Amino acid sequence: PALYFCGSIRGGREDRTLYERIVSRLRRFGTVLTEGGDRLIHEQDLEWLQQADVVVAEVTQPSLGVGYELGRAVAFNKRILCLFRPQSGRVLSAMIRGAADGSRFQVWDYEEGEVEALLDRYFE
Amino acid sequence: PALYFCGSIRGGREDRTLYERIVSRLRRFGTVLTGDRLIHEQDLEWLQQADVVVAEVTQPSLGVGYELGRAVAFNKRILCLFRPQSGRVLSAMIRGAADGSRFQVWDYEEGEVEALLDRYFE
Ligand SMILES: O=P(O)(O)OC[C@H]1CN(Cc2cncc(CO)c2)C[C@@H]1O
Numbered sequence: 001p002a003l004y005f006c007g008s009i010r011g012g013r014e015d016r017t018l019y020e021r022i023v024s025r026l027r028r029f030g031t032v033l034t035e036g037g038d039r040l041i042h043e044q045d046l047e048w049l050q051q052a053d054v055v056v057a058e059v060t061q062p063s064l065g066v067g068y069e070l071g072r073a074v075a076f077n078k079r080i081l082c083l084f085r086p087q088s089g090r091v092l093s094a095m096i097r098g099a100a101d102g103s104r105f106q107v108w109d110y111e112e113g114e115v116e117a118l119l120d121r122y123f124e
Numbered sequence: 125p126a127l128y129f130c131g132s133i134r135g136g137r138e139d140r141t142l143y144e145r146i147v148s149r150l151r152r153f154g155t156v157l158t159g160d161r162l163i164h165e166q167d168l169e170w171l172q173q174a175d176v177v178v179a180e181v182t183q184p185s186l187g188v189g190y191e192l193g194r195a196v197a198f199n200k201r202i203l204c205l206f207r208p209q210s211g212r213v214l215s216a217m218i219r220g221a222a223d224g225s226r227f228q229v230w231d232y233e234e235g236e237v238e239a240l241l242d243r244y245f246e
């Protein structure tokens with residue numbers, strides 16, 4: 001299983017420690033392809049994105065990059081899991097919340113402390 | 125001339141005034157189109173029926189980025205407006221998706237937005 005991980009960087013790194021947690025778990029389930037010059041980045045991740053079997057994304061921290069990766073990932077027909085925290089106070093965008101279909105694209109609300117648990121349940 | 129605008133909403137509304145300015149100008153030049161699943165499907169419709177997607181991308185937003193991802197995949201023509209005065213560095217997914225031709229990113233100053241839009245639209 002080849003896994004692509006999306007999570008905010010230039011939109012804010014508020015959740016970096018959580019991203020690391022989320023990635024540490026994914027490496028128990030597969031290789032993680034992720035992690036003028038912005039053109040290299042764009043070009044490289046678009047290739048990794050093409051190769052993934054699951055696209056896992058943390059969508060609390062608003063970010064253009066994460067949004068665009070999801071848009072290209074829907075186009076490529078990839079299987080997509082999004083993770084959102086209602087505790088944050090924000091309201092997930094409707095473009096994300098309503099691209100969900102309940103299987104190929106899923107969106108799960110969670111509390112930050114049980115992310116490993118949830119991850120175990122999805123990749124089983 | 126069918127026009128789709130995107131700007132931040134559930135990821136921030138600091139630029140609401142500036143969005144109104146862009147929409148007003150957009151209307152000179154053409155038709156402007158602007159449950160959560162209704163919204164996603166209805167918007168994905170206009171996005172498809174569009175001939176050019178204009179996004180203001182100064183403020184980070186999942187939905188503007190998504191819409192942009194889908195428009196690159198609908199090979200639609202795209203123009204992005206970015207404000208260095210915000211102090212943000214724009215996402216590399218946006219600056220680097222650009223090809224100078226069918227996908228453009230222009231850095232402008234808040235005052236000149238009307239002028240930029242006039243140049244873009246002959
Ligand atoms: O928050 P961002 O920055 O807008 O997008 C964040 C997403 C886009 N990423 C690709 C990327 C990787 N290294 C630097 C950049 C510069 O942005 C972008 C991975 C991340 O999931």
Ligand SMILES: O=P(O)(O)OC[C@H]1CN(Cc2cncc(CO)c2)C[C@@H]1O
Pocket residue numbers: 092093094095129130131132133134135136163167185186187188
């Ligand atoms: O900031 P957002 O919400 O993440 O995305 C912002 C873009 C998504 N919009 C579609 C939309 C329309 N009515 C409510 C919502 C609630 O999101 C969203 C147009 C806007 O260009």
